[PDB]
Amino acid sequence: AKRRVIVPIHPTPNFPAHFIKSAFTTDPLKEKQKARFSSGGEAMREVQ
């Protein structure tokens, strides 16, 4: 099928773990889906 392959990015001094699992995906049927949202200190207190 000529299935595309993606090699994992490991944590880096500028590229911490959560940045990687949130901004990078090794399964390329999940590319080009859409934006995900998350909340930080105050917007989290509002939503939760």
Binding site: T12, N14, F19, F24, Q33, A35, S38, S39
Partner: protein
């Protein structure tokens, strides 16, 4: 021969002071301006947005090195 017994005076006075800085006092470091981050956008394979504080953003950073990242009101 010995004619005498005496008590050993010495002048130990330090009256001058010479202190020289060692080299590493003047070496560089990396310093940064620091503001409160209101939000973050990351994109590499898939875009992800985190919003800490919603306000009108007065400053915006863009950084391309590994992943595209945009630090809002940073």
């Amino acid at each position: 021969m010995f004619l005498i017994h005496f008590v050993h005076y010495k002048t130990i006075l330090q009256k001058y002071t010479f202190k020289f800085k060692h080299i590493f006092l003047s070496i560089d470091k990396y310093n940064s301006l620091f503001f409160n981050i209101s939000g973050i956008l990351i994109w590499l394979n898939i875009i992800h947005i985190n919003i800490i504080l919603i306000k009108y953003s007065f400053f915006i950073l863009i950084n391309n090195f590994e992943y595209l990242i945009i630090l809002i009101s940073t």
